[PDB]
């Protein structure tokens, strides 16, 4: 056994480091992490800065999808935010319906 990288076999401590500048750099020149790490392929990491991103509409407020359905859901019924809501378990009727004239308002001044 003993294959090949045994001559200097890397570790999360270098690869902590490949944290410090993706985040000092802002996970653009992920030429940084294997031109950094070299040995091997400096991918297996996309699967945490790029899949972790997704906020909500204002933290606690509305969510995506839940923007979406609404935003797809007016235009299924109509004003029955008592029944967007009903979809959505959590927000009311009057919670929906202002989420309107909120920030779903956009298809007003056309």
Known sequence: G????????????????????????????????????????????????????NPEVKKSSWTEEEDRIIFEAHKVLGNRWAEIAKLLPGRTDNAVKNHWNSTIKRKVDT
């Open 2 to 53: 003993i294959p090949d990288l045994v001559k200097g076999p890397w570790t999360k401590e270098e690869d902590q480091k490949v944290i410090e500048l993706v985040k000092k750099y802002g996970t653009k020149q992920w030429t940084l992490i294997a031109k950094h790490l070299k040995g091997r392929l400096g991918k297996q990491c996309r699967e945490r800065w790029h899949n972790h991103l």
